[PDB]
Design a protein around this ligand. Sequence first.
Ligand SMILES: [Ca+2]
Lengths: 368, 368, 5, 5
Amino acid sequence: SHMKFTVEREHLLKPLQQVSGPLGGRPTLPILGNLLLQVADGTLSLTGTDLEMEMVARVALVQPHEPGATTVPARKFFDICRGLPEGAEIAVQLEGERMLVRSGRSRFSLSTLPAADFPNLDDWQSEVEFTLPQATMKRLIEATQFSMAHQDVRYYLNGMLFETEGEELRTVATDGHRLAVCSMPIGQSLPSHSVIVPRKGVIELMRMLDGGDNPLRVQIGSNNIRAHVGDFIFTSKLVDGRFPDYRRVLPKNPDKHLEAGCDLLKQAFARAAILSNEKFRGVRLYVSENQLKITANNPEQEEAEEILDVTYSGAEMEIGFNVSYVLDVLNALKCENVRMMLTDSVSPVQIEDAASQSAAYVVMPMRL
Amino acid sequence: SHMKFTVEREHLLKPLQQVSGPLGGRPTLPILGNLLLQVADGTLSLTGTDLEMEMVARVALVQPHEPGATTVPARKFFDICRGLPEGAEIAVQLEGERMLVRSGRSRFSLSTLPAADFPNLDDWQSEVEFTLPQATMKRLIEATQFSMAHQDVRYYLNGMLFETEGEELRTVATDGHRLAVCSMPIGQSLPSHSVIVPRKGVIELMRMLDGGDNPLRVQIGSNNIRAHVGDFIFTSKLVDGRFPDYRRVLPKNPDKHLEAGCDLLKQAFARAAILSNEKFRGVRLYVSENQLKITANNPEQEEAEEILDVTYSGAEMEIGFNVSYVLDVLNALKCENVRMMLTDSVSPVQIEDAASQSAAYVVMPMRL
Amino acid sequence: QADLF
Amino acid sequence: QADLF
Ligand SMILES: [Ca+2]
C-alpha cells in the first residue's frame, strides 16, 4: 500500500490503548490480533475488533502523509510506540508486506495482513439517536453493571438493557437473582425502544468515557449500538434475545420499610460475611422496632452477630440473603442512608438511596 | 485456656498482616491456616508458620489481660479486625474450644485448635550475629532476588546465599544462566560464613522490611536464620545443600569495557525485545568504537534494530543474550550509568553500576 | 437462593 | 543459552 504517516508518540498512545480494548488473548482468527490502520484525507484511523464489537480512533495528520491502509500486530505496534522516548516522532510506511516503523535511531519491520481481510461492523442504520453527557452515561452503567450475569447460559442476561421512553434513558441488569435499574432524563423526546448490549461491550463503553465536557452521541440500530465521543467511535452488536420486564419484578406493595446508615450497614454486613458459608455466603437479617440484627454461621459452627440501630416500621421478620448481593448494592449506592422495602422472607426486597429514586435494586432472598 | 486481652484495632492490623505472610491460602493441615496467640507478662505474641519459616509479632498489652494461648483462623481473625471501625477496641477471650471476639455491637465466635498443637521452629543456637539498617538488608535482597532459580531440580539454587566476610554481608543468587551478587559493609568484624536461605523465606524477609534505617539484628545458626526488627521476628530453616563456588564464575580479566546511560540502554533493549523470539528471547549486540547496535528477529522474520552512542574502545565484537536476563539487570540497577565488561562471544558479561562496585551481575551469552 | 423470575 | 557452571 502507499500508506505513510509521521505522528508524535503521545498523539498515538491513547488511541492505540482504546482501540486495543476489544482484543483479548489468543485470537480465534489471526487478523483479530491486528489493528487496521487507514490514512485518508488528513486523518489516520485505527480500528480494533473482536467480531462482536469494534473501537475506532481518528488522529489528525499535520505532517506529510500518503493514503493507504494495512493491518499490523496490535500488541507489538503498541509496545513499540509506548517504548519510544517521550516526544518521539514515529514515521510509518509500507515496504511490500512489511510495515516499517522508524523513530530516532530505532527501526522495526512488522508483518502485516491486508486491510481487505479486516472485518467491518459499520454497515447498518440507526433507528434511535440521542446525545448526553459522558458522566451521565457512565453513571447509568456504573449503577447497574455489577448485576449483569457473567457467564449465564441464559445469554440474554449476560448484558445490560438500554431502554428509551419519553425523555428518559434507562439501564437494567439482572442475573435472575438480583436486579439493578437506573433512569436518567436526557431532555429529548425519544421513541419507546429497548436493546441488550453484551456484557463485554458495556464494560468497554464504560472505559471509553472520562466524564469530560465532551458529549456522547448514541445511535441504536436494529442489531447494533454505536457511541461517538471525541475522536473515538465504539460499535457493538446487540444481543438477540428477550430481556425480562423490570416493571414486573419491582415489589408493588411492600408493607415493611427500613432505613439505616449506609456505611454502618455495609460494614456490619462485610464483617458478618467473614463467618458465612464460603460458597453460598448466606446471612440472616432480623428486623424489629428500630433494630436490625445480622447473623452468619458456617459449617465450622463459627458465628458472627451484628446489631444496628435503624428506623423500622412493620412486623418483626427474619430474612436470608446472599451477603455479596447486598454488599454490591451498598457499594454502588453513594449516599448516607439506604431504604430497604420488604414484605416477607420469600419475596424480593428493594434497596435504594433513601433520598433518591433514580436507581433501584431488587434482591431475592435465600431460604433460611 | 485463660487467655484474655483487649487491644486497639490498629495495634493488631500490621502484626496480623506480617505473621500471616507465611500462610499460603490452602494449608495442608488446618492448624497451619491458624495463628498462634500467646499472652504472657504484658505481651501478646502472634505466630504464623508454614513449617519451613515462621513470623512472630509482639504486642505490648496496656489493658487488662489474662495469660494463656490458643490458635485461631488467620484470615478470619485478620478480616474481622480490619473490618471493625477505626479506633475500635477488640476484646478477646476463650470459651471452651471457641474464641469470642467482641467490639462495639459486633460479636464473633471462632473455632480454635489447641496451642499445644502449634509447631515450634525457635529451638536452635546462634553461631554468627550482626546488626545492620533494615534498608541495607532490603537493598541486598532486591538487588539479587530476581536471579534465584524457581523450582530447579538443583534445589540449592532455589534460594539465596548469605555470606559474611570481613565487615561485609553479601547476597548471591543464580539459576545457572545468570548470577547476581551484592555486597554491603556493615562495620562489624564477621567470621567467614555462608548459608542458603530458601526463596520463599527470602521473599518474606524482604516484605517484612521497609526502607527505614531501623536496626535489623540477624542471627545465623547451623540450620536456621533469624531476623529481628522492631517488634517482629522472622525465622527460616536454611537450605541443606551446597551453593556453587560463585567466585569461580566471575570473569577474571575482561579486556572490553562499555559504559552507557542506564535508561537509554534499558529502553533500547526493551524495544528490541518486542521482536525477539517469545520463548528464547535472543538478541544480538554489536559493539564497535563508541557504538552499540542491538538487533532482534523472531520466527515471523520481523526485525528490530537499535543504535546507541556509548563509550567503548575495545575490539569489534558480536555477542548474543537472552534479553530478559539483561533487562532484569538494568531494572535492578537504580543508577544513571552502567558499565558492561566483556571478553569474547562465548564468555559471560559482567554488568555493574558505572560508579559503584557494590553489585555485580554476570550473564552468560547465547549461541546466536 | 430463590429466583427473581 | 550457555551455562555459567
Ligand atoms: Ca503529530
